[PDB]
Amino acid sequence: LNPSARIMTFYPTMEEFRNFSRYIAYIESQGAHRAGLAKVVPPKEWKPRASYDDIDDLVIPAPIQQLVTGQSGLFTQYNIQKKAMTVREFRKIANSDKYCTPRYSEFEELERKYWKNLTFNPPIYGADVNGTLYEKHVDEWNIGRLRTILDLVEKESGVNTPYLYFGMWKTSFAWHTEDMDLYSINYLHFGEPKSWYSVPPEHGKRLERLAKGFFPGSAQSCEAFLRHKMTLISPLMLKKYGIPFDKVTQEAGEFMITFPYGYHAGFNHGFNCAESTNFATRRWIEYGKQAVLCSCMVKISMDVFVRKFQPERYKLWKAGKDNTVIDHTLPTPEAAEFL
Ligand SMILES: O=c1[nH]cnc2c(-n3cc(CCN4CCC(Cc5ccc(Cl)cc5)CC4)cn3)nccc12
Ligand SMILES: [Zn+2]
Numbered sequence: 145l146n147p148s149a150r151i152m153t154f155y156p157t158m159e160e161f162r163n164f165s166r167y168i169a170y171i172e173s174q175g176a177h178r179a180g181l182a183k184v185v186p187p188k189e190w191k192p193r194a195s196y197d198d199i200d201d202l203v204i205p206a207p208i209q210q211l212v213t214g215q216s217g218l219f220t221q222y223n224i225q226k227k228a229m230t231v232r233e234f235r236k237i238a239n240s241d242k243y244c245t246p247r248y249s250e251f252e253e254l255e256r257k258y259w260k261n262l263t264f265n266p267p268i269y270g271a272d273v274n275g276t277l278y279e280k281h282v283d284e285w286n287i288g289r290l291r292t293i294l295d296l297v298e299k300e301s302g303v304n305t306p307y308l309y310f311g312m313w314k315t316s317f318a319w320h321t322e323d324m325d326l327y328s329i330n331y332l333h334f335g336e337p338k339s340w341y342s343v344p345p346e347h348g349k350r351l352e353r354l355a356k357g358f359f360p361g362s363a364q365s366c367e368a369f370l371r372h373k374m375t376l377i378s379p380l381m382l383k384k385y386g387i388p389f390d391k392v393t394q395e396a397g398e399f400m401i402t403f404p405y406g407y408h409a410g411f412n413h414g415f416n417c418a419e420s421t422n423f424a425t426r427r428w429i430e431y432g433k434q435a436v437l438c439s440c441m442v443k444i445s446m447d448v449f450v451r452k453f454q455p456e457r458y459k460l461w462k463a464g465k466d467n468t469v470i471d472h473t474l475p476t477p478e479a480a481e482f483l
């Protein structure tokens with residue numbers, strides 16, 4: 145389903161929520177994947193940590209200062225690595241007069257203030273922090289241990305590990321797909337909202353074509369230059385060039401799911417914390433095999449997946465004759481139980 149490819153929101157009951165791989169198959173069966181991004185609001189009784197007041201001494205080893213260059217909706221983000229700091233040190237900076245969220249009536253106002261000021265007063269993003277804020281006993285939707293078919297990488301051979309994102313106002317993530325065109329889970333533990341922009345995978349190539357036209361020097365240097373996660377394109381720029389996209393705001397205690405080859409970027413409203421990781425379903429294997437990778441980085445040997453799930457195609461794929469065409473609208477084989 146999902147004909148217009150719009151971002152869908154789900155409210156699973158505690159029973160539906162219990163199985164992660166089953167629910168993903170469920171949301172795929174409802175066409176959630178067509179948007180490239182879906183929101184999952186978990187049961188009201190469900191909590192992964194009783195309190196976030198015990199993490200002030202937690203170390204952010206490589207905070208990055210985000211320097212943005214550009215104009216006319218077109219930007220490049222340069223990351224400057226800064227010395228290690230604590231969550232206590234970070235929160236103090238985030239909430240300071242120099243870095244705090246401006247006063248705003250509505251989101252459209254905050255969005256406009258972001259697109260107008262992202263080049264000034266560079267913020268610090270306490271991104272890519274190895275760790276989890278989930279309590280060990282928490283079995284439902286545990287980012288640390290999702291136990292998807294992706295775990296085969298580690299089982300046989302940090303993509304499968306959790307990462308925390310301590311954000312402040314204006315810190316942002318550039319347009320990108322997941323490494324190896326994998327899926328992603330992103331839980332916002334606490335704090336101020338996280339706004340998201342998404343392009344449906346079926347229009348993924350249009351955005352690429354548009355970026356290739358805007359940064360031809362970057363495109364001549366690298367086939368998959370968007371993977372560098374440095375390109376920022378404003379919603380107005382996308383609308384001007386007729387690129388279909390959708391937007392959504394993630395609030396604390398909500399989950400966002402990025403689907404294979406579903407381009408996304410966004411920004412933080414203020415001081416917050418988000419944990420994320422990559423995962424996979426049987427549908428991903430074909431995206432993993434066909435993924436255009438950074439030539440100038442995260443690379444996964446597909447051989448193990450093709451052995452187990454496509455042994456009949458192993459010889460044809462190892463010969464370079466696997467001419468399989470991907471249908472971005474087809475749900476995962478695991479969704480059969482719902483069709
Ligand atoms: O809100 C967001 N903020 C920031 N980023 C976001 C985001 N993505 C962030 C990543 C990077 C993930 N990860 C990559 C690898 C890196 C360590 C590394 C490197 C090489 C090798 Cl070979 C082994 C390990 C650590 C980091 C991918 N998507 N998606 C959605 C939302 C957000
Ligand atoms: Zn991502």
Ligand SMILES: [Zn+2]
Binds near residue numbers: 369
């Ligand atoms: Zn590259």
